[PDB]
Design an enzyme around this catalytic site. Structure first.
Site, PDB file in Angstrom:
ATOM      1  N   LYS B  50       0.804  -1.214   0.000  1.00 36.15           N
ATOM      2  CA  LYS B  50       0.000   0.000   0.000  1.00 36.15           C
ATOM      3  C   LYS B  50       0.845   1.275   0.000  1.00 36.15           C
ATOM      4  O   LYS B  50       2.039   1.241   0.275  1.00 36.15           O
ATOM      5  CB  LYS B  50      -0.897  -0.004   1.202  1.00 36.15           C
ATOM      6  N   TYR B 276      15.318  32.561   1.812  1.00 33.15           N
ATOM      7  CA  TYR B 276      14.277  33.356   2.469  1.00 33.15           C
ATOM      8  C   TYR B 276      14.589  33.601   3.929  1.00 33.15           C
ATOM      9  O   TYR B 276      15.072  32.710   4.632  1.00 33.15           O
ATOM     10  CB  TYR B 276      12.913  32.681   2.364  1.00 33.15           C
TER      11      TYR B 276
HETATM   12  C1  LIG Z   1      -3.530  -3.413   8.912  1.00 37.71           C
HETATM   13  C2  LIG Z   1      -2.053  -3.447   8.560  1.00 37.71           C
HETATM   14  N1  LIG Z   1      -1.409  -4.640   8.462  1.00 37.71           N
HETATM   15  C3  LIG Z   1      -0.096  -4.722   8.145  1.00 37.71           C
HETATM   16  C4  LIG Z   1       0.681  -3.579   7.920  1.00 37.71           C
HETATM   17  C5  LIG Z   1       2.187  -3.712   7.584  1.00 37.71           C
HETATM   18  O1  LIG Z   1       3.085  -3.253   8.648  1.00 37.71           O
HETATM   19  P1  LIG Z   1       4.723  -3.343   8.532  1.00 37.71           P
HETATM   20  O2  LIG Z   1       5.115  -2.206   7.636  1.00 37.71           O
HETATM   21  O3  LIG Z   1       5.291  -3.210   9.924  1.00 37.71           O
HETATM   22  O4  LIG Z   1       4.974  -4.691   7.894  1.00 37.71           O
HETATM   23  C6  LIG Z   1       0.052  -2.327   8.008  1.00 37.71           C
HETATM   24  C7  LIG Z   1       0.920  -1.094   7.742  1.00 37.71           C
HETATM   25  N2  LIG Z   1       0.398   0.165   8.264  1.00 37.71           N
HETATM   26  C8  LIG Z   1       1.121   0.898   9.322  1.00 37.71           C
HETATM   27  C9  LIG Z   1       2.649   0.539   9.368  1.00 37.71           C
HETATM   28  C10 LIG Z   1       3.675   1.652   9.169  1.00 37.71           C
HETATM   29  C11 LIG Z   1       4.856   1.141   8.347  1.00 37.71           C
HETATM   30  C12 LIG Z   1       6.154   1.119   9.151  1.00 37.71           C
HETATM   31  N3  LIG Z   1       6.604  -0.261   9.322  1.00 37.71           N
HETATM   32  C13 LIG Z   1       0.728   2.374   9.409  1.00 37.71           C
HETATM   33  O5  LIG Z   1      -0.451   2.679   9.045  1.00 37.71           O
HETATM   34  O6  LIG Z   1       1.547   3.207   9.890  1.00 37.71           O
HETATM   35  C14 LIG Z   1      -1.341  -2.254   8.331  1.00 37.71           C
HETATM   36  O7  LIG Z   1      -2.011  -1.040   8.434  1.00 37.71           O
HETATM   37  C1  LIG Z   2      12.250  32.462  -8.695  1.00 39.23           C
HETATM   38  C2  LIG Z   2      10.790  32.568  -8.317  1.00 39.23           C
HETATM   39  N1  LIG Z   2       9.983  33.431  -8.985  1.00 39.23           N
HETATM   40  C3  LIG Z   2       8.685  33.566  -8.683  1.00 39.23           C
HETATM   41  C4  LIG Z   2       8.108  32.811  -7.659  1.00 39.23           C
HETATM   42  C5  LIG Z   2       6.616  33.005  -7.311  1.00 39.23           C
HETATM   43  O1  LIG Z   2       6.493  33.558  -5.967  1.00 39.23           O
HETATM   44  P1  LIG Z   2       5.130  33.614  -5.119  1.00 39.23           P
HETATM   45  O2  LIG Z   2       4.585  32.219  -5.144  1.00 39.23           O
HETATM   46  O3  LIG Z   2       5.649  34.030  -3.775  1.00 39.23           O
HETATM   47  O4  LIG Z   2       4.293  34.626  -5.848  1.00 39.23           O
HETATM   48  C6  LIG Z   2       8.912  31.897  -6.936  1.00 39.23           C
HETATM   49  C7  LIG Z   2       8.231  31.089  -5.799  1.00 39.23           C
HETATM   50  N2  LIG Z   2       8.982  29.999  -5.173  1.00 39.23           N
HETATM   51  C8  LIG Z   2       9.155  29.998  -3.712  1.00 39.23           C
HETATM   52  C9  LIG Z   2       7.813  29.866  -2.950  1.00 39.23           C
HETATM   53  C10 LIG Z   2       7.558  31.018  -1.955  1.00 39.23           C
HETATM   54  C11 LIG Z   2       6.348  30.732  -1.051  1.00 39.23           C
HETATM   55  C12 LIG Z   2       5.250  31.799  -1.166  1.00 39.23           C
HETATM   56  N3  LIG Z   2       4.175  31.354  -2.035  1.00 39.23           N
HETATM   57  C13 LIG Z   2      10.174  28.998  -3.200  1.00 39.23           C
HETATM   58  O5  LIG Z   2      11.145  28.633  -3.912  1.00 39.23           O
HETATM   59  O6  LIG Z   2      10.024  28.591  -2.037  1.00 39.23           O
HETATM   60  C14 LIG Z   2      10.282  31.784  -7.284  1.00 39.23           C
HETATM   61  O7  LIG Z   2      11.132  30.925  -6.637  1.00 39.23           O
END
Ligand SMILES: Cc1ncc(COP(=O)(O)O)c(CN[C@@H](CCCCN)C(=O)O)c1O
Ligand SMILES: Cc1ncc(COP(=O)(O)O)c(CN[C@@H](CCCCN)C(=O)O)c1O
Lengths: 384, 384
Positions: B50, B276
């Site tokens: 999943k 920033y």
């Molecule tokens: C009902 C159920 N059964 C089996 C598993 C498999 O677990 P495993 O990855 O330890 O094999 C999951 C994973 N869901 C969890 C597991 C996190 C994954 C980190 N191991 C969740 O929803 O956080 C689960 O939701």
């Molecule tokens: C070079 C450049 N030009 C124009 C924009 C557009 O800016 P605006 O979305 O603020 O109007 C960005 C946004 N990139 C930013 C996102 C700023 C978060 C605010 N929305 C970045 O690289 O984190 C940029 O990196």
């Protein structure tokens, strides 16, 4: 998180999607249209559309950028470029970050203008254009505002020299200079601007290239809307387009709502715990909602015992750890929440609202940091 | 993120991907072969696949699952299921979370066994099978370890009763009872097994149930590996498959590396600040590496002035706020770093290592909170 896309378009419905993201087609046009008038024929618009349109679907939004005949489009990733072009946007298209070389080469076919911030960078990129017979147009990035990111530091004499040789390039055509403002403060943008100005002036004068054939472009959203003198030739605007910009300018309408379904509602006893590691203890005797969303889906782990959703207009607490695909929420106060309802993970729900303000606070960083990846991890679906 | 895709297939390549997720097919094929052995053929195996295979590509993980005669796959979303079947896997396919009815319904086409946790949910779902001419196979979920999540609470008569009517459903073959464990811990997992046992015993009895038609199945990964007796009829493993499980069990290999490029390297002078909000001041005349990865890419804002990344095997620090697309690191101590160099953001590079433990540290949540989404916002590329 659709597993089959054709240029941003999926086959998914709201019915058969577990959690989804709704781009408002309408808010969009109203935002484009509003900027377009506020700008007033004193400046051009690049719609800043990187991050797949900030998690709105560059493929979904391209229609409307074309519709409101916007002249220009900024992207970041090569795919964003393919999709814009494949939409028929016969216009100006520019990368607003430095690329890697291999990347840039592939990009050539899309006829995008590429950002350059260093003579060594310039040099390589030049040999790549020569290699293909092509002439590559470039925006020179200038570190005027202090980002120390994409552009040459024209502050020191070294930079000024580096700047020169950027133009000595015989297979690159120079067509802009630019900086990007670093603090969202009026005064600080104002310095940035005064700098960008002398440095453009300086470089134009002293590299005996001419104004007429360049577009000078520094203003982001906040810059455009707040320090208009900073507009100059063209502005690049992401956020405002999508209605997260200066909280006060409320004429800029939110374009994106994030949503899931209620799977079913279960009863549990006083003294049960909820989700991994028994974090929440059930205070009374409870009803809980299994909501079909997790961190896999975007709704991050940090919302553990902190966040809230809206169902039927009801502000409802997130409880226990956020499992990978399933969110647990206490409806123990709200007998009227039922199977198949509609959860609002972020936005308004006739009555209620989860504020961008309140989600940022929980997250520890700005909202983009969540929503640009909600975008990636769910189906984007057009509305209005 | 590929904007065009087919069943989790893309024409994206390390050359034009700006960042990307490498899935190691031997790490996979090994891990499966390892379980299958350690299990001893004495207890059946679901690949819990999943979240698009824990962010590994599900349509990527499949051909190996098929080839090693894994008899069951555990998915969450509908697409995941469509893709399992698209890939030619034919055997038992369960969903490990309650779906909402609309989603459950759409899924009928794929022949999936559905998780069920309450009487009302059940009758509703009975309704749908009914309308469709089908006999839907259902896994009953018990709240034996007290996740309070999908499981009918069997610690209370009313709930106990619910169980029974879940079984009285005309249009649902009840084909398993299961639960899931809440604490990765030898003792707490045991209590839950002991609980689960009496409850399965009890149900089989009072509902008059053929033990030879049920699969009793409870153990996740940690439980399978650390508590053999909980293996019962079948297990349910993800982490193990991907080599993210008990750190101590090193026989299970990482199947994922996270990777990006150097855009170029800029000389910024002392006194400059980076990114920033001036978050970081240069104590020296630096050489800064510009990396074509950013928070939109999955590499999230939590790592501002915290993270380390590897280039040419060098532990190099993140500087300034992780921007949306580009990431700035300090290569002043490391002149071997040139543009085009491959960057490990998570994993190992000749001799250095970016550990799961050190990233979880900064994130504040398990590594799956990050990398299931790295999966989503980046192309996945098969290796080995
Ligand atoms: C009902 C159920 N059964 C089996 C598993 C498999 O677990 P495993 O990855 O330890 O094999 C999951 C994973 N869901 C969890 C597991 C996190 C994954 C980190 N191991 C969740 O929803 O956080 C689960 O939701
Ligand atoms: C070079 C450049 N030009 C124009 C924009 C557009 O800016 P605006 O979305 O603020 O109007 C960005 C946004 N990139 C930013 C996102 C700023 C978060 C605010 N929305 C970045 O690289 O984190 C940029 O990196």
């Amino acid at each position: 998180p659709p597993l089959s896309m054709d240029n941003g378009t999926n086959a998914l419905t709201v019915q058969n999607s577990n959690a989804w993201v709704e781009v408002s087609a309408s808010a969009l046009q109203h935002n484009i249209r509003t900027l377009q008038a506020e700008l007033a024929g004193k400046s051009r618009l690049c719609a800043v559309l990187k991050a797949d349109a900030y998690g709105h679907g560059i493929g979904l939004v391209m229609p409307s950028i074309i519709a409101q005949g916007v002249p220009c489009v900024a992207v970041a990733s090569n795919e964003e470029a393919r999709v814009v072009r494949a939409s028929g946007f016969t216009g100006q298209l520019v990368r607003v970050r430095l690329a890697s070389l291999s990347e840039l080469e592939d990009a050539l076919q899309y006829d995008m203008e590429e950002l350059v911030g260093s003579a060594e960078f310039a040099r390589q990129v030049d040999a790549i254009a020569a290699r293909h017979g092509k002439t590559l147009r470039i925006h020179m990035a200038l570190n005027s505002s202090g980002m120390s990111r994409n552009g040459v530091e024209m502050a020191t004499w070294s930079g000024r020299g580096e700047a020169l040789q950027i133009t000595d390039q015989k297979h690159l055509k120079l067509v802009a200079l630019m900086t990007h403002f670093a603090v969202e403060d009026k005064d600080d943008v104002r310095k940035g601007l005064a700098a960008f100005n002398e440095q453009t002036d300086w470089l134009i004068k002293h590299a005996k290239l001419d104004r007429s054939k360049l577009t000078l472009h520094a203003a982001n959203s906040f810059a455009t809307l707040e320090v208009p003198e900073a507009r100059l030739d063209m502005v690049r605007t992401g956020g405002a387009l999508f209605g997260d910009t200066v909280p006060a300018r409320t004429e800029y309408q939110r374009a994106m709502q994030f949503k899931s379904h209620v799977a079913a509602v279960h009863s549990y006893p006083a003294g049960n715990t909820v989700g991994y590691d028994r974090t929440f203890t059930l205070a009374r005797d409870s009803r809980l909602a299994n909501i079909t969303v997790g961190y896999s889906d975007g709704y991050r782990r940090v919302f553990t015992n902190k966040g809230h959703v809206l169902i039927n207009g009801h502000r409802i607490p997130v409880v226990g750890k956020v499992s990978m695909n399933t969110l647990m929420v206490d409806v123990t106060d709200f007998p009227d929440v039922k199977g198949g309802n509609e959860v609002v993970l972020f936005g308004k729900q006739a009555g209620g609202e989860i504020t961008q303000a309140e989600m940022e606070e929980i997250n520890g960083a700005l909202l983009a940091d969540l929503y640009t990846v909600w975008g990636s991890s769910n189906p984007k679906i057009l509305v209005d």
